[PDB]
Design a protein around this ligand. Structure first.
Ligand SMILES: [Zn+2]
Ligand SMILES: [Zn+2]
Ligand SMILES: [Zn+2]
Ligand SMILES: [Zn+2]
Lengths: 23, 155
């Protein structure tokens, strides 16, 4: 589903942002 | 034998989602590994509350795209969480972001129905994390590694 992928990509981006900040 | 990692994970995640949805803290003490679970829950409050605040517009957008109709309507969310990890990368930033969006979905469920239950949601999150990343979680020392990775001050 195209919307599910957009949501996943957004959650992944936020998640990497938080991970890079505390890495 | 028992699945203590699943039990402990579901308790932390369910507690956070319930208190976020209802606005009230649960008073009864936690079970096995209470020390870790308490710190983990406190870390989730500090970090997760911030993730939600700092990304609330994107979170609202995602809610709109998922159009979650009721407390049992969590299959798409499960697919999303599996998709998040499908590039093969696992880290605590991604994990806390999924739990934070879970609490956001939990508050949404309450707006559409005051009697909404959060257990189906907390179970779907816990399943993705514990079942599909079991050994990764073990290697990271579970919720101790979660607490240590964010090292929140004055817990
Ligand atoms: Zn993809
Ligand atoms: Zn951010
Ligand atoms: Zn194993
Ligand atoms: Zn610190």
């Amino acid at each position: 589903a195209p919307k599910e992928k957009e949501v996943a990509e957004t959650l992944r981006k936020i998640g990497e942002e938080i991970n890079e900040a505390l890495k | 034998g028992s699945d203590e990692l699943y039990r402990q994970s579901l308790e932390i995640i369910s507690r956070y989602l319930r208190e976020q949805a209802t606005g009230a803290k649960d008073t009864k003490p936690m079970g096995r590994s209470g020390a870790t679970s308490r710190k983990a829950l406190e870390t989730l409050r500090r970090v997760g509350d911030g993730v939600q605040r700092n990304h609330e517009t994107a979170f609202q957008g995602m809610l709109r795209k998922l159009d979650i109709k009721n407390e049992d309507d969590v299959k798409s969310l499960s697919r999303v969480m599996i998709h998040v990890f499908s590039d093969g990368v696992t880290n605590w930033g991604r994990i806390v972001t999924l739990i934070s969006f879970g609490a956001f979905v939990a508050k949404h469920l309450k707006t559409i129905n005051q009697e909404s239950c959060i257990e189906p949601l907390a179970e779907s999150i816990t399943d993705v994390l514990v079942r599909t990343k079991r050994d990764w979680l073990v290697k990271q020392r579970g919720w101790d590694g979660f607490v240590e990775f964010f090292h929140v001050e004055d817990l």
